Design a protein around this motif. Structure first.
Motif, PDB file in Angstrom:
ATOM      1  N   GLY A  49       0.788  -1.252   0.000  1.00 23.73           N
ATOM      2  CA  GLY A  49       0.000   0.000   0.000  1.00 23.73           C
ATOM      3  C   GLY A  49       0.816   1.298   0.000  1.00 23.73           C
ATOM      4  N   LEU A  50       2.154   1.269  -0.141  1.00 21.97           N
ATOM      5  CA  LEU A  50       2.988   2.506  -0.266  1.00 21.97           C
ATOM      6  C   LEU A  50       3.440   2.707  -1.726  1.00 21.97           C
ATOM      7  CD1 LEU A  50       5.124   2.095   3.011  1.00 21.97           C
ATOM      8  CD2 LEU A  50       3.045   3.451   2.683  1.00 21.97           C
ATOM      9  N   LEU A  51       3.420   3.965  -2.196  1.00 20.64           N
ATOM     10  CA  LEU A  51       3.893   4.403  -3.530  1.00 20.64           C
ATOM     11  C   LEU A  51       5.388   4.731  -3.453  1.00 20.64           C
ATOM     12  CD1 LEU A  51       3.130   5.259  -6.432  1.00 20.64           C
ATOM     13  CD2 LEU A  51       2.687   7.541  -5.542  1.00 20.64           C
ATOM     14  N   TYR A  52       6.184   4.223  -4.389  1.00 23.01           N
ATOM     15  CA  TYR A  52       7.646   4.489  -4.455  1.00 23.01           C
ATOM     16  C   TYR A  52       7.944   5.239  -5.757  1.00 23.01           C
ATOM     17  CZ  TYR A  52       8.382   1.295  -0.433  1.00 23.01           C
ATOM     18  OH  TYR A  52       8.359   0.676   0.793  1.00 23.01           O
ATOM     19  N   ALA A  53       8.727   6.317  -5.674  1.00 25.42           N
ATOM     20  CA  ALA A  53       9.264   7.028  -6.854  1.00 25.42           C
ATOM     21  C   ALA A  53      10.769   6.744  -6.942  1.00 25.42           C
ATOM     22  CB  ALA A  53       8.976   8.505  -6.752  1.00 25.42           C
ATOM     23  N   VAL A  54      11.209   6.168  -8.071  1.00 27.74           N
ATOM     24  CA  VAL A  54      12.571   5.576  -8.249  1.00 27.74           C
ATOM     25  C   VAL A  54      13.302   6.294  -9.386  1.00 27.74           C
ATOM     26  CG1 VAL A  54      13.828   3.384  -8.248  1.00 27.74           C
ATOM     27  CG2 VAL A  54      11.385   3.402  -7.699  1.00 27.74           C
ATOM     28  N   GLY A  55      14.503   6.810  -9.106  1.00 29.67           N
ATOM     29  CA  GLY A  55      15.407   7.408 -10.113  1.00 29.67           C
ATOM     30  C   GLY A  55      14.819   8.602 -10.864  1.00 29.67           C
ATOM     31  N   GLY A  56      15.170   8.733 -12.139  1.00 27.59           N
ATOM     32  CA  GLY A  56      14.831   9.907 -12.964  1.00 27.59           C
ATOM     33  C   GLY A  56      15.925  10.961 -12.891  1.00 27.59           C
ATOM     34  N   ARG A  57      15.555  12.225 -13.105  1.00 22.40           N
ATOM     35  CA  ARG A  57      16.481  13.383 -13.005  1.00 22.40           C
ATOM     36  C   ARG A  57      15.686  14.674 -12.840  1.00 22.40           C
ATOM     37  NH1 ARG A  57      19.001  15.549 -18.775  1.00 22.40           N
ATOM     38  NH2 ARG A  57      17.071  15.497 -20.005  1.00 22.40           N
ATOM     39  N   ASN A  58      16.408  15.737 -12.487  1.00 18.33           N
ATOM     40  CA  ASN A  58      15.910  17.133 -12.425  1.00 18.33           C
ATOM     41  C   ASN A  58      16.563  17.906 -13.572  1.00 18.33           C
ATOM     42  OD1 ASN A  58      14.875  19.613 -11.775  1.00 18.33           O
ATOM     43  ND2 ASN A  58      16.138  19.878  -9.937  1.00 18.33           N
ATOM     44  N   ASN A  59      15.818  18.121 -14.645  1.00 20.29           N
ATOM     45  CA  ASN A  59      16.243  18.950 -15.798  1.00 20.29           C
ATOM     46  C   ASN A  59      15.574  20.307 -15.591  1.00 20.29           C
ATOM     47  OD1 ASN A  59      16.311  20.384 -18.206  1.00 20.29           O
ATOM     48  ND2 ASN A  59      15.529  18.724 -19.478  1.00 20.29           N
ATOM     49  N   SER A  60      16.318  21.269 -15.036  1.00 21.41           N
ATOM     50  CA  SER A  60      15.887  22.684 -14.844  1.00 21.41           C
ATOM     51  C   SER A  60      16.701  23.595 -15.770  1.00 21.41           C
ATOM     52  CB  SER A  60      15.981  23.099 -13.379  1.00 21.41           C
ATOM     53  OG  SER A  60      17.273  23.604 -13.043  1.00 21.41           O
ATOM     54  N   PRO A  61      16.352  24.897 -15.890  1.00 18.24           N
ATOM     55  CA  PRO A  61      17.182  25.838 -16.647  1.00 18.24           C
ATOM     56  C   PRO A  61      18.539  26.066 -15.965  1.00 18.24           C
ATOM     57  CG  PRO A  61      14.942  26.683 -16.316  1.00 18.24           C
ATOM     58  CD  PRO A  61      15.154  25.541 -15.338  1.00 18.24           C
ATOM     59  N   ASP A  62      18.649  25.746 -14.668  1.00 17.42           N
ATOM     60  CA  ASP A  62      19.874  25.972 -13.855  1.00 17.42           C
ATOM     61  C   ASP A  62      20.829  24.775 -13.964  1.00 17.42           C
ATOM     62  OD1 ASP A  62      18.844  28.480 -12.759  1.00 17.42           O
ATOM     63  OD2 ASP A  62      17.592  27.246 -11.436  1.00 17.42           O
ATOM     64  N   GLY A  63      20.399  23.630 -14.513  1.00 11.38           N
ATOM     65  CA  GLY A  63      21.238  22.408 -14.544  1.00 11.38           C
ATOM     66  C   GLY A  63      20.481  21.113 -14.826  1.00 11.38           C
ATOM     67  N   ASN A  64      21.238  20.021 -14.967  1.00 13.10           N
ATOM     68  CA  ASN A  64      20.780  18.617 -15.173  1.00 13.10           C
ATOM     69  C   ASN A  64      21.421  17.752 -14.089  1.00 13.10           C
ATOM     70  OD1 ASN A  64      19.247  19.001 -17.557  1.00 13.10           O
ATOM     71  ND2 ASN A  64      21.107  18.904 -18.808  1.00 13.10           N
ATOM     72  N   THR A  65      20.615  17.135 -13.226  1.00 13.45           N
ATOM     73  CA  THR A  65      21.102  16.270 -12.123  1.00 13.45           C
ATOM     74  C   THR A  65      20.308  14.955 -12.141  1.00 13.45           C
ATOM     75  OG1 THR A  65      21.612  18.307 -10.996  1.00 13.45           O
ATOM     76  CG2 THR A  65      21.806  16.300  -9.676  1.00 13.45           C
ATOM     77  N   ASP A  66      20.982  13.868 -12.520  1.00 13.67           N
ATOM     78  CA  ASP A  66      20.444  12.485 -12.487  1.00 13.67           C
ATOM     79  C   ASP A  66      20.265  12.068 -11.021  1.00 13.67           C
ATOM     80  OD1 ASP A  66      20.459  12.232 -15.357  1.00 13.67           O
ATOM     81  OD2 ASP A  66      22.550  11.555 -15.298  1.00 13.67           O
ATOM     82  N   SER A  67      19.198  11.318 -10.728  1.00 12.33           N
ATOM     83  CA  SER A  67      18.777  10.944  -9.351  1.00 12.33           C
ATOM     84  C   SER A  67      19.052   9.460  -9.080  1.00 12.33           C
ATOM     85  CB  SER A  67      17.324  11.266  -9.134  1.00 12.33           C
ATOM     86  OG  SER A  67      16.916  10.862  -7.836  1.00 12.33           O
ATOM     87  N   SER A  68      19.682   9.170  -7.949  1.00 11.99           N
ATOM     88  CA  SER A  68      19.781   7.821  -7.340  1.00 11.99           C
ATOM     89  C   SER A  68      18.682   7.638  -6.277  1.00 11.99           C
ATOM     90  CB  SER A  68      21.167   7.618  -6.760  1.00 11.99           C
ATOM     91  OG  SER A  68      21.415   8.552  -5.711  1.00 11.99           O
ATOM     92  N   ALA A  69      17.756   8.584  -6.150  1.00 10.66           N
ATOM     93  CA  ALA A  69      16.845   8.647  -4.984  1.00 10.66           C
ATOM     94  C   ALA A  69      15.726   7.602  -5.097  1.00 10.66           C
ATOM     95  CB  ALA A  69      16.283  10.039  -4.837  1.00 10.66           C
ATOM     96  N   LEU A  70      15.309   7.107  -3.934  1.00  3.01           N
ATOM     97  CA  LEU A  70      14.058   6.341  -3.688  1.00  3.01           C
ATOM     98  C   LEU A  70      13.269   7.115  -2.628  1.00  3.01           C
ATOM     99  CD1 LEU A  70      12.415   3.664  -4.102  1.00  3.01           C
ATOM    100  CD2 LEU A  70      13.629   2.774  -2.127  1.00  3.01           C
ATOM    101  N   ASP A  71      12.036   7.497  -2.947  1.00  2.02           N
ATOM    102  CA  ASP A  71      11.150   8.269  -2.039  1.00  2.02           C
ATOM    103  C   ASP A  71       9.834   7.500  -1.929  1.00  2.02           C
ATOM    104  OD1 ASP A  71      12.719  10.829  -1.258  1.00  2.02           O
ATOM    105  OD2 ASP A  71      12.879  10.844  -3.440  1.00  2.02           O
ATOM    106  N   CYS A  72       9.297   7.427  -0.710  1.00  2.00           N
ATOM    107  CA  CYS A  72       8.099   6.641  -0.333  1.00  2.00           C
ATOM    108  C   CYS A  72       6.947   7.567   0.071  1.00  2.00           C
ATOM    109  CB  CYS A  72       8.415   5.718   0.836  1.00  2.00           C
ATOM    110  SG  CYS A  72       7.024   4.618   1.206  1.00  2.00           S
ATOM    111  N   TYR A  73       5.807   7.471  -0.635  1.00  2.00           N
ATOM    112  CA  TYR A  73       4.544   8.203  -0.351  1.00  2.00           C
ATOM    113  C   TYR A  73       3.531   7.291   0.359  1.00  2.00           C
ATOM    114  CZ  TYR A  73       0.102  10.761  -1.016  1.00  2.00           C
ATOM    115  OH  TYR A  73      -1.096  11.398  -0.840  1.00  2.00           O
ATOM    116  N   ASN A  74       3.031   7.748   1.508  1.00  5.05           N
ATOM    117  CA  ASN A  74       2.005   7.056   2.329  1.00  5.05           C
ATOM    118  C   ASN A  74       0.647   7.719   2.095  1.00  5.05           C
ATOM    119  OD1 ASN A  74       0.353   5.964   4.236  1.00  5.05           O
ATOM    120  ND2 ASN A  74       1.846   6.076   5.916  1.00  5.05           N
ATOM    121  N   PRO A  75      -0.293   7.089   1.358  1.00  4.85           N
ATOM    122  CA  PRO A  75      -1.576   7.732   1.075  1.00  4.85           C
ATOM    123  C   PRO A  75      -2.415   8.072   2.323  1.00  4.85           C
ATOM    124  CG  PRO A  75      -1.255   5.776  -0.317  1.00  4.85           C
ATOM    125  CD  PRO A  75      -0.187   5.751   0.761  1.00  4.85           C
ATOM    126  N   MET A  76      -2.114   7.467   3.480  1.00  7.94           N
ATOM    127  CA  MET A  76      -2.831   7.692   4.771  1.00  7.94           C
ATOM    128  C   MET A  76      -2.420   9.038   5.379  1.00  7.94           C
ATOM    129  SD  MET A  76      -5.046   5.411   5.231  1.00  7.94           S
ATOM    130  CE  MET A  76      -5.085   5.162   3.454  1.00  7.94           C
TER     131      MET A  76
END
Ligand code: NA
Ligand code: NA
Ligand code: NA
Ligand code: NA
Lengths: 286, 286
Positions: A49-76
């Protein structure tokens, strides 16, 4: 049952922070808590029942940063919490779940195209490497069927791929399978009624509307009805025996379109629109 | 009388296909035939009244493809024609012309930072390797002075460079010269009244507005008046004894600004705006 389609992050002019949830029963959208860091080219999945967001990157006008991150969302609690990061950043990642474990497949770190694969154990909050794929793959799709993991298409650093391979968790090894009819990086890959579907993506010239499915016992790929809209970097998921595809890029526009596939009639229909056009979302159902 | 400043390609969210021409006499812009394939990080040059677009890459939402392409624009027909491609792809390349021959210097292909150099002969439509540089250089500037070719600054894969080196075409060898006062990748490099100018660029922390020039007989780099706006990956050229800098990146914005340096008064002024902000253009005069 009351299960929702969650869409996390995406890209329009820059990487986005949105978390929104669609209810296919009553056609409503929820606006939920923003990601702590903007993300595109990520994957979504659900464990316990938990949502996980895995990897990706932040492509902004200030830079490009690839992500090693794992973040967990609790709908409760409507709250994002950080989890242990992966061994390496993975942009345009593929993910699948087997037996409550998350598999992170392929993706890029700048110019580096990974064949490496790693597995997350939620109970211990730890990642470990497993056997690497036979092929380097970014913009890869992943499907889980019969407690095996399939990596479909992508880009190896030189060539765009029609190839696919199959992971055996108990033996910890990969085998190549029959290649798709069409070359596809940035396609939507999922499982419906014991078949692996590959929808849309990019063949090296054009964004695709074609859709093909792999029968595991016949070992053959077959074309089904095409989508209304050509799209690459689309989100894909399954809700109540139907495929939903969310957004993507058609070569001009970042799409707000959501289409739905009915396997009984072999027809696509437009069911709703996201609140704004985007590509490179992560999507999962809980 | 009637020479124009041509600007080809560039980047704003994706690689661009624009060819536009500014007339410094009357302040007009022409919209000419689009490039066949989008390009950023390319270089422009002119031989026998024809404009050439060399190297770069196509950074689109579907991929990052470094280019080995050479394409020729004929202002009499308003048509682009393909010419023989280089031995390797070269993104953020440097280009100079000696005796009607095009020199392609450095640049990147994926993770590879080139020190190789090759020479194009228009009468035969062929490229040949010549002696490599002493240093690997991407984001390098090139200047031709007294029938010698100077390679200035850039990035070698690890460090950003203040180093500069000189190519001797008759002997086919390179020698290091005196290093610049400032570290610069993605500077504009040109020749004016027998001196090599390096305008702007990136030092690893900040985009630069400083400008320095090398006198070949004093073997000394001296600062002159700085530009109004800090910029890297700018286009640069000389028209009627003045320097023109076109667009670039300041660490947040993609500039439409065109600034002009008067060497008699040592002053910069803003003369016009490009139709849209962009970095990584190719520029030449004919
Ligand atoms: Na960016
Ligand atoms: Na999938
Ligand atoms: Na790209
Ligand atoms: Na130059």
């Amino acid at each position: 049952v009351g299960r929702l389609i969650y869409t996390a992050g995406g890209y329009f002019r820059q990487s986005l922070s949105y978390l929104e949830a669609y209810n296919p029963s009553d056609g409503t959208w929820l606006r939920l808590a923003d990601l702590q860091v903007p993300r595109s080219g990520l994957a979504g999945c659900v464990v316990g029942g938990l949502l996980y967001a895995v990897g990706g990157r932040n492509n902004s006008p200030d830079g490009n940063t690839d992500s090693s991150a794992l973040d967990c969302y609790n709908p409760m609690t409507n709250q994002w919490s950080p989890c242990a990061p992966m061994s390496v950043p993975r942009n345009r990642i593929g993910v699948g779940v087997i037996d409550g474990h998350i598999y992170a497949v392929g993706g890029s770190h700048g110019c580096i195209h990974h064949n490496s694969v790693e597995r997350y154990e939620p109970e211990r909050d730890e990642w470990h490497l497993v056997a690497p794929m036979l092929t380097r793959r970014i913009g890869v799709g992943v499907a889980v069927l019969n407690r095996l993991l399939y990596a479909v298409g992508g880009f190896d650093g030189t060539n765009r791929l029609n190839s696919a391979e199959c992971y055996y968790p108990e033996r910890n090894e990969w085998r190549m399978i029959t290649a798709m009819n069409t070359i596809r990086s940035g396609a939507g890959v999922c499982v419906l009624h014991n078949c692996i579907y590959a929808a849309g993506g990019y063949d090296g010239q054009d964004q695709l509307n074609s859709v093909e499915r792999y029968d595991v016992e016949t070992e053959t790929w077959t074309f089904v009805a095409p989508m209304k809209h050509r799209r690459s970097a689309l989100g894909i998921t399954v809700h109540q025996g139907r495929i939903y595809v969310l957004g993507g890029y058609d070569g001009h526009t970042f799409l707000d379109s959501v289409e739905c596939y009915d396997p009984d009639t072999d027809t696509w229909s437009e069911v709703t629109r996201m609140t704004s056009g985007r590509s490179g979302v992560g999507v999962a159902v809980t």
